[PDB]
Design a protein around this nucleic acid. Structure first.
Lengths: 41, 180, 96, 48, 128, 138, 98, 154
RNA sequence: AGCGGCGAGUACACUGUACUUGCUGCUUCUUAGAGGAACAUUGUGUGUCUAACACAAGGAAGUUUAAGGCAACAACAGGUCUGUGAUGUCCUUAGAUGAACUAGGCUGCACGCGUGCUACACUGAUAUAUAUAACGAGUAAAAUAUGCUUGCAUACUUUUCCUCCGCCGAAAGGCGUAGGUAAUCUUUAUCAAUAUAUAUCGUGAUGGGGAUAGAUUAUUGCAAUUAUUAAUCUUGAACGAGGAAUGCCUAGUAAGCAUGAUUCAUCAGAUUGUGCUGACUACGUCCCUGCCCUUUGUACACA
């Protein structure tokens, strides 16, 4: 079941492992810091 | 020269047992940007082993029920998976890949009385066992199959009990302790 | 509810109806249908209102019910109704 | 009668005079039964 | 923030803001979606920052939406042949009005009603 | 001057014409970049690394590519351009470097100069598959 | 001037018949046309009754067309065809000018 | 990322030389800014495709459909409603019966083409029976293509 | 089917290009008339040096280059006299066992077995589009006018195939026309799906998935009730990869995915073809099953 939340290496997978979040909000936080899947910089 | 997914060229590999090397067959002729070339295997005994191990997974993890017969998405999942391997771990994705395929094969199995495994089936059962770890680690596991892969290849390559393939290898070796 | 339907022309009565009857009526009525109507009207005028009209011989499954001939029983005792007309006849042997 | 120019009744095989298993491929208007023995003379060369 | 309980289930707070109003009923994602667009609610946010104001806007939206711009066919049970033209009546009232519909076929009691009564598919489930 | 060359491999047949110019290459109205697969774009790029863009910088190779599979288009076009450059070296520009040109293509592989004749077959009677039968009961 | 048949040798002989008269008469004659053959195929079950294994047979008819043109007199070409054509072969006539 | 090195001689004389989906995305971007066209208020209640069975959920389905139809115009100067329907064909699942490919909905493309005719970017004519760009349309879309080319090149 | 070439260019390069008009310098290109080429082929090997078999190689073509059909002798008391004016014998015709017409049935169902059709998802649920091929297949009636009083009779084109287009209708579908008896019109400088790259979701019986509904709208046929077919809204069974059992299958094939054709007025969930993606492993065995040969034992010969 789902218990992760948007509340609180910008890699989606690594940050999701580090913070236990949904993948949509994980890419949200990726956008929050930087500003289907992409090749990495 | 070439670049696997515009990233990798696997210019350094591990020794392993030096026997699985000919089976894994990483070389320039088999070098390719993405798997799913027009490679053919239906003539002799080598070219199935000639085919790159990357293709040997992009064509072997594919089976699950309806999910059968979708291979472009198999290249998709392997492309993403290689991302996550080198991201969650500091080693080359293909290097830890070779490590996993080397140390994920059963060294023996009775199968009617124990009998050693040829390197072909050593690679074969390694691939099969990791892919059937992937399926039941994608079913009823909360996490997605991509992160399941990122967990299982490291689990099998570093000798971590979480990999299904290593547990099955131990079970398959255990039959020797009763027969041979 | 019912008198307007009784007196209403076929052209808008069929707009009240559904397109399955609409296509049928606009495409053909056939001679047997008109014979049956001109005979059931005779039976309706002759028979008393104290009892239901008699059934129709030479049974068939494609006599559309138009709500101006309500009352009859059939030669299967489900009486035709204003909510029932747009359903054809049926009423057959599915003996169980 | 109840004749019309429609359905399986308006046409039938031209030798057996039956409406069953009639093939009209290229309007051949024949049944599979008698056709299977007229195939060579008509020109149908069983090849591959 | 999240978890609001209303007449229909809205546990999908961690889920999407539009699905907060599309999972309440009409799983077909069409009646729910037309109600959503008539309520003018963006999908980028999530259901955890929804307003009772928007909910009230919806409880005014679904009130006989024939008055709204929606066409005749899209709305469920378009004709339901009678003196008027009836409507989709969602959730408990949906069950009540389709209960009216299922009782009204008792007078019909034709082949199709008798069959669905005796337990046979109206088209035949073909247990043959 | 002008030579017209063909490439037949799998479904797709590529047609090209090597012409005088500066290196203008055209794929329908598209270029060698918008076909979609950057994976096969570099497959076609391989000869240009084998030979060099400097020599391509003095001749125009128009291309029309039409019909067939995505793999077959690229595999036909590589053979068509190879035949075109070979014909131009034979006819107009230079022969001695053509000798080595064939050698450096063939060193990479024989697949470029000539492709494969693998093709599908008439499916056989018995079931949906060519070689698969309907499930049998006893 | 186009020809129709099904067995290729007929069209081959009646086509070899064509250009010899043109060469003899030095006419303004257009070049030949070599169309892809048409194949007509049908499938039908063996076994008149339903018993036994279901088995079918496939058929084939090869159909052969070519087209010519000549700036030659219509009556003379019609006769020089009718002299040496087979009823099993069908011909149509049309003319050119230049 | 979408760029790769170009050592061969280019022309950049038209729009077919440049990307397609990103070009129509940038065309939709310019289309939001200039807004010569409507949404319209009619597309929001009917699904794009018969076999789509879903709402588009983009608030831009019409906006990118017009862009794509313009790209198809540019490619093929002879197309019709049947052509666009086939170009937009999609699968349809019939429940217990098998999937089947079926075309799109005609009216959405008909409205898009009538809006294009009002915009004057395209026109009709008996000869070349399909949709053919005007010369003004050619110059506008070509300068658009050159602008698009340069804004990503430099 | 083109290739050009120049005839004017629509926009750019600078000392040709995408979109267009028209014909003719020319036919490897789009193609078929024709034959050729593949022959243990050359050498390095196994084999009584015989039959045969191996590697490497050129070559598109080395397992007969693969895949397609033809099936001897003898038999079955296999199926069919419901295919035939193929047919013996027996049997019957005005109260038919001939024909037609009305309605009905094989769609009805505790169940069981096949052939199959649709999920159990994130290797996926979803929206946009580029790069998409082939076998394909396609022409005794409308309506109008008059007379009698919508229906009958008589007169004039050809509607009676696929359809392209431009319109109308969410759609189904409806309207008027271009083409074509057909490498010419659907369509083919291109017809489906598994796609695609980024976007909503990110395995929470979930939004997956659809057994299940009434309400109807248009077509098909004179007739759709037994919801033929079909557009929308409502539906929310089982389903966590599977009882004992059991089927098929070694290369562009299995499988997935579609799709052509037949039966067709309307209807694949049937049958026969075609294409895309080109999977896991076998240069094998007689363990099961079932054949072939030799010897052997038989009291079996209906074996």
């Amino acid at each position: 079941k789902l218990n992760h939340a948007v509340f609180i290496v910008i890699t989606p997978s690594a940050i999701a492992e580090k913070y236990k979040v949904n993948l949509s909000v994980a890419r949200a936080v990726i956008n929050h810091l930087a500003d289907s899947q992409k090749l990495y910089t | 020269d070439i670049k696997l997914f515009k990233k990798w060229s696997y210019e350094e590999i591990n020794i392993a047992d030096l026997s699985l090397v000919d089976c894994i067959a990483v070389s320039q002729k088999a070098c390719v940007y993405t798997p799913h070339t027009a490679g053919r295997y239906q003539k002799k005994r080598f070219r199935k082993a000639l085919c790159p191990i990357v293709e040997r997974l992009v064509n072997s993890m594919m089976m699950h029920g309806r999910n059968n017969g979708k291979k472009l998405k198999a290249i998709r999942i392997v492309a993403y998976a290689f991302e996550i391997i080198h991201l969650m771990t500091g080693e080359n994705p293909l290097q830890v890949f070779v490590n996993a395929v080397q140390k994920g094969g059963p060294r023996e199995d009775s199968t009617r009385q124990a009998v050693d495994v040829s390197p072909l089936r050593r690679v074969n059962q390694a691939i099969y066992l990791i892919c059937t770890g992937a399926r039941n680690a994608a079913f009823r596991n909360i996490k997605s199959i991509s992160e399941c892969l990122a967990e299982e290849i490291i689990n099998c390559a570093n000798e971590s009990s979480s990999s299904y393939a290593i547990k099955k290898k131990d079970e398959i070796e255990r039959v020797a302790k009763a027969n041979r | 509810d019912l008198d307007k339907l009784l007196d209403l022309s076929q052209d808008e009565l069929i707009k009240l109806f559904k397109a399955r009857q609409r296509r049928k009526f606009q495409r053909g009525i056939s001679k047997k249908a008109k014979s049956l109507l001109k005979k059931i009207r005779k039976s309706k005028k002759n028979c008393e209102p104290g009892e239901k009209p008699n059934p129709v011989p030479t049974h068939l499954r494609n006599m559309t019910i138009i709500p101006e001939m309500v009352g009859s029983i059939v030669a299967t005792n489900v009486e035709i109704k204003p909510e029932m007309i747009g359903y054809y006849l049926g009423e057959f042997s599915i003996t169980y | 009668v109840h004749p019309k120019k429609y359905g399986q009744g308006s046409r039938q095989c031209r030798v057996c005079s039956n409406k069953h298993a009639i093939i009209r491929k290229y309007n051949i208007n024949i049944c599979r039964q008698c056709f299977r023995e007229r195939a060579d003379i008509i020109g149908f060369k069983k090849y591959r | 923030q999240h978890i609001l309980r209303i007449l229909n289930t809205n546990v999908d707070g961690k889920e999407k803001v539009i699905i907060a109003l599309t999972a309440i009923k009409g799983i077909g994602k069409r009646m729910a979606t037309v109600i959503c667009k008539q309520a003018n609610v963006d999908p980028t946010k999530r259901a955890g920052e929804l307003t009772t104001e928007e909910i009230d806007n919806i409880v005014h939206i679904m009130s006989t939406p024939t008055q709204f711009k929606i066409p005749d066919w899209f709305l469920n049970r378009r004709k339901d042949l009678k003196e008027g033209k009836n409507i989709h009546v969602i959730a408990n009232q949906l069950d009540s009005y389709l209960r009216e519909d299922l009782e009204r076929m008792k007078k019909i009691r034709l082949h199709r009603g008798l069959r669905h009564h005796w337990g046979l598919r109206v088209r035949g489930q073909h247990t043959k | 001057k002008r030579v017209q060359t063909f490439g037949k491999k799998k479904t797709a047949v590529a047609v090209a014409t090597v012409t005088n110019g500066k290196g203008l290459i055209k794929l329908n109205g598209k270029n060698l970049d918008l076909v979609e697969p950057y994976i096969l774009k570099t497959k076609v790029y391989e000869p240009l690394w084998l030979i060099g863009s400097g020599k391509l910088k003095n001749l125009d190779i128009r291309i029309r590519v039409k019909g067939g599979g995505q793999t077959s288009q690229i595999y036909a076009i590589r053979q068509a351009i190879g035949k075109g450059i070979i014909s131009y070296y034979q006819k107009y520009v230079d022969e001695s470097t053509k000798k080595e040109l064939k050698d450096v293509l063939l060193r990479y592989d024989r697949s470029l100069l000539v492709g494969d004749t693998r093709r599908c077959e008439p499916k056989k009677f018995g079931g949906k598959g060519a070689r698969a039968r309907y499930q049998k009961s006893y | 001037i186009a020809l129709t048949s099904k067995n290729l040798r007929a069209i081959e002989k009646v086509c070899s018949d064509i250009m010899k008269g043109a060469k003899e008469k030095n006419l303004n004659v257009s070049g030949p046309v070599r169309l892809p053959v048409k194949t007509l195929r049908i499938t039908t079950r063996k076994s008149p009754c339903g018993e036994g294994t279901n088995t079918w047979d496939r058929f084939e008819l090869r159909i052969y067309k070519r087209l010519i043109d000549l700036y030659s007199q219509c009556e003379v070409v019609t006769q020089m065809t009718s002299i040496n054509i087979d009823p099993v072969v069908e011909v149509e006539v049309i003319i050119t000018d230049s | 990322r979408l760029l790769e090195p170009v050592p061969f001689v280019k022309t950049n004389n038209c729009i077919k030389d440049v990307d397609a989906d990103l070009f129509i995305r940038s065309y939709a971007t310019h289309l939001k800014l200039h807004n010569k066209i409507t949404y319209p208020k009619w597309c929001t209640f009917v699904k794009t495709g018969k076999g789509r069975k879903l709402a588009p959920l983009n608030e831009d389905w019409y906006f990118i459909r017009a862009s794509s139809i313009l790209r198809r115009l540019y490619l093929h100067p002879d197309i019709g409603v049947g052509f666009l329907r086939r170009q937009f064909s999609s699968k349809q699942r019939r429940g217990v019966a098998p999937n089947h490919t079926s075309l799109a909905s005609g009216k959405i493309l008909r409205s898009i083409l009538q809006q294009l005719e009002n915009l004057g970017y395209v026109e009709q004519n008996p000869k070349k029976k399909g949709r053919r760009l005007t010369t003004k349309g050619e110059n506008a879309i070509n300068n658009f293509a050159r602008y698009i080319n340069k804004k990503v090149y430099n």
